Write an enzyme that holds these catalytic residues in place. Sequence first.
Site, PDB file in Angstrom:
ATOM      1  NE  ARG A  31     -32.895 -35.870   6.036  1.00  0.00           N
ATOM      2  CZ  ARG A  31     -32.717 -36.366   4.817  1.00  0.00           C
ATOM      3  NH1 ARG A  31     -32.152 -35.628   3.876  1.00  0.00           N
ATOM      4  NH2 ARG A  31     -33.186 -37.567   4.517  1.00  0.00           N
ATOM      5  CB  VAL A  82     -35.021 -43.733   9.079  1.00  0.00           C
ATOM      6  CG1 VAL A  82     -36.187 -43.460  10.020  1.00  0.00           C
ATOM      7  CG2 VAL A  82     -34.459 -45.124   9.327  1.00  0.00           C
ATOM      8  CG  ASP A  83     -34.767 -38.264   7.627  1.00  0.00           C
ATOM      9  OD1 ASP A  83     -34.338 -38.812   6.588  1.00  0.00           O
ATOM     10  OD2 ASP A  83     -34.264 -37.221   8.093  1.00  0.00           O
ATOM     11  CB  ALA A  84     -36.655 -40.488   2.681  1.00  0.00           C
TER      12      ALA A  84
END
Lengths: 52, 52, 266, 67, 77, 77, 77, 77, 77, 77, 77, 77, 77, 77
Positions: free
Chosen positions: C207, J58-60
């Site tokens: 990320r 959510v964004d994993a």
Amino acid sequence: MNLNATILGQAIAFVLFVLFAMKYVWPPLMAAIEKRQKEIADGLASAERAHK
Amino acid sequence: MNLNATILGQAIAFVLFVLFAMKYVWPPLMAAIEKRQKEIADGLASAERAHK
Amino acid sequence: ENMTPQDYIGHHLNNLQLDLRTFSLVDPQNPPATFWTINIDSMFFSVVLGLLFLVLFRSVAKKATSGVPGKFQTAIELVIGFVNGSVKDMYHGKSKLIAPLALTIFVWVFLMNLMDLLPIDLLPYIAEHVLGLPALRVVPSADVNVTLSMALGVFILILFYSIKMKGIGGFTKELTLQPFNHWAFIPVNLILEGVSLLSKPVSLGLRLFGNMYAGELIFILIAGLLPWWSQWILNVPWAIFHILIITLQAFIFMVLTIVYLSMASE
Amino acid sequence: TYHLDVVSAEQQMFSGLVEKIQVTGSEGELGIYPGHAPLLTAIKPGMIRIVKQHGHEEFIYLSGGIL
Amino acid sequence: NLNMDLLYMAAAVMMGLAAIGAAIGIGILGGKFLEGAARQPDLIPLLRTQFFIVMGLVDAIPMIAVGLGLYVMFAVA
Amino acid sequence: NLNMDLLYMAAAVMMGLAAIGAAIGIGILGGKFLEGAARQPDLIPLLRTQFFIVMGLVDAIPMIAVGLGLYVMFAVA
Amino acid sequence: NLNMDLLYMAAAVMMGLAAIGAAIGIGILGGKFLEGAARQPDLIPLLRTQFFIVMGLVDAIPMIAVGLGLYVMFAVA
Amino acid sequence: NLNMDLLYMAAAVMMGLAAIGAAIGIGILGGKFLEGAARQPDLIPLLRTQFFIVMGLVDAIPMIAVGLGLYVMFAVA
Amino acid sequence: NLNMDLLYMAAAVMMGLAAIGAAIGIGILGGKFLEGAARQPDLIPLLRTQFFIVMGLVDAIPMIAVGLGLYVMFAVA
Amino acid sequence: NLNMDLLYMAAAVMMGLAAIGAAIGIGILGGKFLEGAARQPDLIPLLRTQFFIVMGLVDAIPMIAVGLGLYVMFAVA
Amino acid sequence: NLNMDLLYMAAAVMMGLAAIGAAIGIGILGGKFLEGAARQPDLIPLLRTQFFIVMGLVDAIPMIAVGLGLYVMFAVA
Amino acid sequence: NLNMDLLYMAAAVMMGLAAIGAAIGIGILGGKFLEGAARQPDLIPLLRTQFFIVMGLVDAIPMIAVGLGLYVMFAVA
Amino acid sequence: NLNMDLLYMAAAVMMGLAAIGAAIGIGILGGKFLEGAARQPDLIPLLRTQFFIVMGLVDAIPMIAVGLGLYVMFAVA
Amino acid sequence: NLNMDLLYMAAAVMMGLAAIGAAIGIGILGGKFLEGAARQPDLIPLLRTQFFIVMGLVDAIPMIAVGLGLYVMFAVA
């Protein structure tokens, strides 16, 4: 990209900065802050005991 | 290609960026610092009055 | 100058490296294949920013006044109170490590991302033209190696807390029974709970990497592709939007680290 | 600020100026600030918090009603 | 030869799916922002601040894909 | 040659997906704008202001994809 | 040759996607407009006056997609 | 001649996409019309008037795409 | 050979997207028809009348697309 | 050349689908966050922490897909 | 031979798209039926009647799509 | 050669679909958790418990698909 | 090549679209069931019997698609 | 020979679409579960029971499709 030995080099730098911060940096600042916050609350406790 | 002009464009863009950053972004931070200095000064002055 | 823009961009993507088996600086086009080849310039700025953080915080930690604080003191205590409030909301155990770990991550990553805002050619221009070194790209967090180093550190911590606070009996009981709680499911649950645990750090690192790497890549593309008068109009909107990115990506790294350690131990 | 009335069928219970209130509407907690859009709901039995302007906080017990 | 148009097509896919994702995500977020704004109008500057915070994350992946689209189109032709 | 076929196909797929994204994203936003107005029209000029503020963010990526579609279609031909 | 066949395929894609986008965007916006007019029949004037305002933005990109699809089908092919 | 067959795929895709988008767009719009009607049935003709007004816009692009679908299948072929 | 193959694939897309459009568009419309009916059953016959009027528009454009699919399968061969 | 050009399309698919999935999922969650902030503003500090908790889940997978896409385009290239 | 063997893909698309369309459109209609039943359990058989009435329309296009998919798979290919 | 080349596209499609499925399903479940929490803050620890329970179920299948996507990229290469 | 691999692809398409349709359609239906059950904490059997009937309708057509996919997996190939 | 690669493509398609269907279906169902739980907290074990009942039903076709995709990829290919 290129997975590299830098992964270890950075891990060593990371753990050394964590241990110096943990012993040397966090307790002094939090102790000064909480000493102020506590002695202000001691002012509130003194005003309650005065009225009571 | 004119590499010197690319550095020219990077300088002009940074001058405009720092104008926006200083005028808009910095006063909110200084106002938060000065708010907390006011908050602590009032907290200590009220506790000092509670001692008398 | 014999720069085509595609090559200029190619030079801008390349790092500076040192061979740990030959002590040679690495070529603009010829890498050694051996994995022992440190990315020196990001290490240099990574430790320089870790030092600058520890210097500033220890300098106030020794000075610190319990009265009305100094203005610089005020800003350092502001960040200490913000971190402490987040940790104490999310975490409830006594573990002394959690708060300093969260502070060090937040400030170090914030400063690393903040390095990207600087004009992209100025330090590479100084480093090549003054010092003669063949490459420089300055943003430490814009390389996978650093962010995976941090993420794997947190993964080691997650495993350490999950063993230490509930033991192998409970740890295996979680990893085998849930969700479906029956022995035929245990082979399936061992897969699911294992890859879930593996995804938590690796996605933590990726990320940060993806956002910072493309954030730099846009400034590289803007410098390479466009004429000087046009470069500012596109550059300024992306720089100001990047301020919001650099802050959120640091804050999310900190918060997810706390959420994972509190979820694991408690 | 805005004006708040707490009125029973028998007698009035509050008529001050308020900055905000918090209530338990039937469909959940609900916090009314100034200018809030027109709304109608039941409220459940239990306490309402008033903060009178200048920030003075008080709790009124209500056996129910409509807000 | 084939190589140029296949890389242009790859960038065209990246931009098209990024534009769908960003447009639908901000449309949904904006709809809930507007129904919130119609509810507590004096709060609109506060809610708009929170909208900008969440918009930064919604934009995060689409800008990655847009940048790589521009890299495939210009940087490797 | 073969490159013009795929260059027009790439421009058409990129601008078509950018049109789907822009049109649905604004439609979703606009419905909550209308429903908010229909309950209390006195807010309409205020809410319309906020509608344009968020709609400008919706169009960010779709218009980039349209600009690259036009460049691929006219300048790259 | 092959060129016209893939040109007509590309324009077909561009117009099909533009028709999807305009249809769903106006369908959602109209649904909320019909709700709004049912909640206050008296206002079916003002709400219509707005609905058109929003529809213009919703349509603006699909109209470009149709325009370029017609440009390809009848000028280039 | 391959030219003969490829036009049929270009029409079949245009008319399939225009059928999906028109059918869902009127399905949504009619749904909000029906729940409007079930609340104020005396208004049902007035809401019919607005429903047909909005339905004409929803259909506007799909009818174009089906018209070119026929033109490609019969008339370019 | 392939000449006959591609016209059946064109039918497969034409009928498949027409089946999706018809199925969703009526599924949504009838869902709101059922909600309005469940609120006021005495109203059911009037809403049933309006439902079939609105359905006729939803249902027509897929059904003509399917008819063109059968034309492509049987008469164009 | 035969081996390299397709890889850019494979990465372009990974990034496009990840961008759609992350952008829409975060838009939905943010919408419910902004609704919750509109109903009870004093909760906004608490709910923002709950938003970052759920958004971290959510964004994993989208970020896993973005990472491996950047590996394929930069490392294998 | 490919001439037959490739037609299985047409049958797979035609019936698969009919399968998603039918399953989602009935899932929506049945959901609104179940909410109507849950609000007024006195009313279940009448709502079940109207649900079956519109459910026939919903199924009508998917069942011809699956029927032609079976005919192409068994009888043409 | 194609054996090597196409497996990266096959992994790409697996990872993109697993990312859309996981991000959408978690986004919807989290949004309903945040609105429930905003309505009932005292319930927040209880609901968060149930949220992690049900999200484990949602999360299970996409992690299968991503795990195989990694095995296709690295292990069978 | 040209024979069997296309048959495996057609089966994978049939069963993937069947899994999409069945899982989403029953997910919607079950969500409305659970909302009715939480509203009527006594009528859980009375509603769940209705759920099983309409679920049987939703599941039957994708199960036709699954049977046809297993026919292509074992009986054609 | 090349015959094995498309079996990896088919397994990628079927497993991806099954993961989409299962994740979105369970996401919607679990969301409605959490809404019900948030209203009636003492009811949570009863609703949790009913949720698991429908929860197994939604994923049956996904479980079939994943099983068959494992069969193709590991056993056949």
